[PDB]
Amino acid sequence: GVTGIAQ
Amino acid sequence: GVTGIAQ
Amino acid sequence: GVTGIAQ
Amino acid sequence: GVTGIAQ
Amino acid sequence: GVTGIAQ
Amino acid sequence: GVTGIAQ
Amino acid sequence: GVTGIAQ
Amino acid sequence: GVTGIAQ
Amino acid sequence: GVTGIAQ
Amino acid sequence: GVTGIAQ
């Protein structure tokens, strides 16, 4: 899958 | 799946 | 599935 | 999968 | 997979 | 604050 | 703050 | 802050 | 801060 | 800061 944190 | 936090 | 928090 | 943190 | 931290 | 996704 | 994804 | 992805 | 990916 | 990827 695709897992992300964008800050 | 696709899991994300965007801040 | 698709799971997200957008802030 | 693809896993990332972008700051 | 692809794993990254970009700062 | 505190922001989380737990799966 | 504290930001997390736990899978 | 503290930012994490745990898989 | 503290930033991590644990797999 | 402290930045890490653990696999």
Short mmCIF file of N, CA and C in Angstrom, two decimals:
data_model
loop_
_atom_site.label_atom_id
_atom_site.label_comp_id
_atom_site.label_asym_id
_atom_site.label_seq_id
_atom_site.Cartn_x
_atom_site.Cartn_y
_atom_site.Cartn_z
N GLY A 1 0.84 -1.23 0.00
CA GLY A 1 0.00 0.00 0.00
C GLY A 1 0.85 1.25 0.00
N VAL A 2 0.19 2.41 0.11
CA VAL A 2 0.87 3.70 0.16
C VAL A 2 0.55 4.37 1.48
N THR A 3 1.58 4.76 2.22
CA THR A 3 1.41 5.36 3.54
C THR A 3 2.28 6.59 3.63
N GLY A 4 1.69 7.72 4.01
CA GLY A 4 2.45 8.96 4.06
C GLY A 4 2.02 9.97 5.10
N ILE A 5 3.00 10.71 5.61
CA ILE A 5 2.75 11.92 6.39
C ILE A 5 3.42 13.08 5.66
N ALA A 6 2.64 14.10 5.34
CA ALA A 6 3.14 15.30 4.68
C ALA A 6 2.91 16.49 5.60
N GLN A 7 3.99 17.19 5.94
CA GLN A 7 3.94 18.35 6.84
C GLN A 7 4.59 19.56 6.18
N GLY B 1 -3.84 -0.64 0.81
CA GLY B 1 -4.68 0.59 0.81
C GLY B 1 -3.83 1.85 0.81
N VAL B 2 -4.49 3.00 0.91
CA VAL B 2 -3.81 4.30 0.96
C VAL B 2 -4.13 4.96 2.29
N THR B 3 -3.10 5.35 3.02
CA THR B 3 -3.27 5.95 4.34
C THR B 3 -2.40 7.19 4.44
N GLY B 4 -2.99 8.32 4.81
CA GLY B 4 -2.23 9.55 4.87
C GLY B 4 -2.67 10.56 5.91
N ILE B 5 -1.69 11.31 6.41
CA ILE B 5 -1.93 12.51 7.20
C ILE B 5 -1.26 13.67 6.47
N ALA B 6 -2.04 14.69 6.15
CA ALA B 6 -1.54 15.89 5.49
C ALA B 6 -1.77 17.09 6.40
N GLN B 7 -0.69 17.78 6.75
CA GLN B 7 -0.74 18.94 7.64
C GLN B 7 -0.10 20.15 6.99
N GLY C 1 -8.53 -0.05 1.61
CA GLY C 1 -9.36 1.19 1.61
C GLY C 1 -8.51 2.44 1.61
N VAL C 2 -9.17 3.59 1.72
CA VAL C 2 -8.50 4.89 1.77
C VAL C 2 -8.82 5.55 3.09
N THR C 3 -7.78 5.95 3.83
CA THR C 3 -7.95 6.54 5.15
C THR C 3 -7.08 7.78 5.24
N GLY C 4 -7.67 8.91 5.62
CA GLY C 4 -6.91 10.15 5.67
C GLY C 4 -7.35 11.16 6.71
N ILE C 5 -6.37 11.90 7.22
CA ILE C 5 -6.61 13.10 8.00
C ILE C 5 -5.94 14.26 7.27
N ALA C 6 -6.73 15.29 6.95
CA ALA C 6 -6.22 16.48 6.29
C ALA C 6 -6.45 17.68 7.21
N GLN C 7 -5.37 18.38 7.55
CA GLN C 7 -5.43 19.53 8.45
C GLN C 7 -4.78 20.74 7.80
N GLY D 1 5.52 -1.83 -0.81
CA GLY D 1 4.68 -0.59 -0.81
C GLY D 1 5.53 0.66 -0.81
N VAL D 2 4.88 1.82 -0.70
CA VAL D 2 5.55 3.11 -0.65
C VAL D 2 5.23 3.78 0.68
N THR D 3 6.26 4.17 1.41
CA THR D 3 6.10 4.76 2.73
C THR D 3 6.96 6.00 2.83
N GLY D 4 6.37 7.13 3.20
CA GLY D 4 7.13 8.37 3.26
C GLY D 4 6.70 9.38 4.29
N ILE D 5 7.68 10.12 4.80
CA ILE D 5 7.43 11.32 5.59
C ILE D 5 8.10 12.48 4.86
N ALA D 6 7.32 13.51 4.54
CA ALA D 6 7.82 14.71 3.88
C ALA D 6 7.59 15.90 4.79
N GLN D 7 8.67 16.60 5.14
CA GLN D 7 8.62 17.76 6.03
C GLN D 7 9.27 18.97 5.38
N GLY E 1 10.20 -2.42 -1.61
CA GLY E 1 9.36 -1.19 -1.61
C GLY E 1 10.21 0.07 -1.61
N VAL E 2 9.56 1.22 -1.50
CA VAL E 2 10.23 2.52 -1.46
C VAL E 2 9.91 3.18 -0.13
N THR E 3 10.95 3.57 0.61
CA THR E 3 10.78 4.17 1.93
C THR E 3 11.64 5.41 2.02
N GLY E 4 11.05 6.54 2.40
CA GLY E 4 11.81 7.77 2.45
C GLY E 4 11.38 8.78 3.49
N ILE E 5 12.36 9.53 4.00
CA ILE E 5 12.11 10.73 4.78
C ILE E 5 12.79 11.89 4.05
N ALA E 6 12.00 12.91 3.73
CA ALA E 6 12.50 14.11 3.07
C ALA E 6 12.27 15.31 3.99
N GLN E 7 13.35 16.00 4.33
CA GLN E 7 13.30 17.16 5.23
C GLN E 7 13.95 18.37 4.57
N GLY F 1 -0.64 19.97 18.46
CA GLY F 1 -1.71 18.98 18.79
C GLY F 1 -1.23 17.56 18.56
N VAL F 2 -2.15 16.60 18.72
CA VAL F 2 -1.86 15.19 18.51
C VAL F 2 -2.75 14.67 17.39
N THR F 3 -2.14 14.07 16.38
CA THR F 3 -2.88 13.59 15.21
C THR F 3 -2.42 12.19 14.89
N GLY F 4 -3.35 11.25 14.77
CA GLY F 4 -2.98 9.87 14.53
C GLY F 4 -3.96 9.04 13.73
N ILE F 5 -3.41 8.10 12.96
CA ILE F 5 -4.19 7.03 12.35
C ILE F 5 -3.61 5.71 12.87
N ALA F 6 -4.47 4.90 13.47
CA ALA F 6 -4.09 3.59 13.98
C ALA F 6 -4.89 2.52 13.24
N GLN F 7 -4.18 1.60 12.59
CA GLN F 7 -4.81 0.53 11.81
C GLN F 7 -4.29 -0.83 12.26
N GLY G 1 4.04 19.38 17.66
CA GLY G 1 2.98 18.39 17.99
C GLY G 1 3.45 16.96 17.76
N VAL G 2 2.53 16.01 17.92
CA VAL G 2 2.82 14.59 17.71
C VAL G 2 1.93 14.08 16.59
N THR G 3 2.54 13.48 15.57
CA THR G 3 1.80 13.00 14.40
C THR G 3 2.26 11.59 14.08
N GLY G 4 1.33 10.66 13.97
CA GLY G 4 1.70 9.28 13.72
C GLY G 4 0.72 8.45 12.93
N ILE G 5 1.27 7.51 12.16
CA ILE G 5 0.50 6.44 11.55
C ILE G 5 1.07 5.12 12.06
N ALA G 6 0.21 4.30 12.67
CA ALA G 6 0.59 2.99 13.17
C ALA G 6 -0.21 1.93 12.44
N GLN G 7 0.50 1.01 11.78
CA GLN G 7 -0.13 -0.07 11.00
C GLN G 7 0.39 -1.42 11.46
N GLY H 1 8.72 18.79 16.85
CA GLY H 1 7.66 17.79 17.18
C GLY H 1 8.13 16.37 16.95
N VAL H 2 7.21 15.42 17.11
CA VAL H 2 7.50 14.00 16.90
C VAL H 2 6.61 13.49 15.78
N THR H 3 7.22 12.89 14.76
CA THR H 3 6.49 12.41 13.60
C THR H 3 6.95 11.00 13.28
N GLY H 4 6.01 10.07 13.16
CA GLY H 4 6.38 8.68 12.92
C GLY H 4 5.40 7.85 12.12
N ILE H 5 5.95 6.92 11.35
CA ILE H 5 5.18 5.84 10.74
C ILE H 5 5.75 4.52 11.26
N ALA H 6 4.89 3.71 11.86
CA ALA H 6 5.28 2.40 12.37
C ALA H 6 4.48 1.33 11.63
N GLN H 7 5.18 0.41 10.98
CA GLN H 7 4.56 -0.66 10.20
C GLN H 7 5.07 -2.02 10.65
N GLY I 1 13.40 18.19 16.05
CA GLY I 1 12.34 17.20 16.37
C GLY I 1 12.81 15.78 16.15
N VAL I 2 11.90 14.82 16.31
CA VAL I 2 12.18 13.41 16.10
C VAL I 2 11.29 12.90 14.98
N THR I 3 11.90 12.30 13.96
CA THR I 3 11.17 11.82 12.79
C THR I 3 11.63 10.41 12.47
N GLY I 4 10.69 9.47 12.36
CA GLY I 4 11.07 8.09 12.11
C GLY I 4 10.09 7.26 11.32
N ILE I 5 10.63 6.33 10.54
CA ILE I 5 9.86 5.25 9.93
C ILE I 5 10.43 3.93 10.45
N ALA I 6 9.57 3.12 11.05
CA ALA I 6 9.96 1.81 11.56
C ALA I 6 9.16 0.74 10.83
N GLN I 7 9.86 -0.18 10.17
CA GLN I 7 9.24 -1.25 9.39
C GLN I 7 9.75 -2.61 9.85
N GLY J 1 18.08 17.60 15.24
CA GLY J 1 17.02 16.61 15.57
C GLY J 1 17.49 15.19 15.34
N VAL J 2 16.58 14.23 15.50
CA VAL J 2 16.86 12.82 15.29
C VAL J 2 15.97 12.30 14.17
N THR J 3 16.58 11.70 13.15
CA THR J 3 15.85 11.22 11.99
C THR J 3 16.31 9.82 11.67
N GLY J 4 15.37 8.88 11.55
CA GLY J 4 15.75 7.50 11.31
C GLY J 4 14.77 6.67 10.51
N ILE J 5 15.31 5.73 9.74
CA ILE J 5 14.54 4.66 9.13
C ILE J 5 15.11 3.34 9.65
N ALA J 6 14.25 2.52 10.25
CA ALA J 6 14.64 1.21 10.75
C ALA J 6 13.84 0.15 10.02
N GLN J 7 14.54 -0.77 9.36
CA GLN J 7 13.92 -1.85 8.59
C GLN J 7 14.43 -3.20 9.04
#
